[PDB]
Amino acid sequence: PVIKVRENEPFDVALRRFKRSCEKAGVLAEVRRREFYEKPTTERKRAKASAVKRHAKKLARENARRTRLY
C-alpha cells in the first residue's frame, strides 16, 4: 500500500501519505489471524470511542489554566 499514483517530480521515496485513502484497514490489517464474518461490527468500529479521550484532553488544557497550576 505504497499506492500507484506518482508524487509530482519523481523521487526514490514514495509519498505514501498523500496517496492512500482507505487501503489496508480490515483486509490486510488482521494478518496471521482467523477471519471472522460479523465480528468487525463490534471489534473494529471504535471511532466514536477514540474521539472522546481527544475531546477530554483538549478540554483539560484550558482547565489547568482555570485552576491556575500553569
Binding site: 500500500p1 505504497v2 499506492i3 500507484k4 506518482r6 519523481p10 526514490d12 521515496v13 514514495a14 505514501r16 487501503e23 489496508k24 483486509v27 490486510l28 488482521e30 494478518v31 496471521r32 489471524r33 482467523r34 477471519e35
Partner: protein, 64 residues
C-alpha cells in the same frame, strides 16, 4: 537482498529499471533504495499490491 539481485543482471546487459511493489512488509522504501544504488532511475514505483475482494482465511497462529 535488492543489491544482490541488481548486481547479477549486468551480465544479461540490462541498463535501466522500473519497479512493481506488492506487499505491506518491511523494505517499503529500503528495497527501492538498493536498486537505485545499483545505478538505476526508479521513477515508477507502481504499487500493484493485490487487494483481494476479501480472500482466503489466514492461519490462526497461537491457540489462545
Amino acid at each position: 537482498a535488492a543489491e544482490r539481485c541488481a548486481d547479477a543482471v549486468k551480465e544479461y546487459g540490462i541498463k535501466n529499471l522500473e519497479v512493481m511493489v506488492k506487499g505491506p512488509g518491511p523494505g517499503r522504501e529500503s528495497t527501492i533504495r538498493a536498486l537505485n544504488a545499483a545505478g538505476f532511475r526508479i521513477t515508477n514505483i507502481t504499487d500493484v499490491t493485490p487487494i483481494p475482494h476479501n480472500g482466503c482465511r489466514p492461519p490462526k497462529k497461537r491457540r489462545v
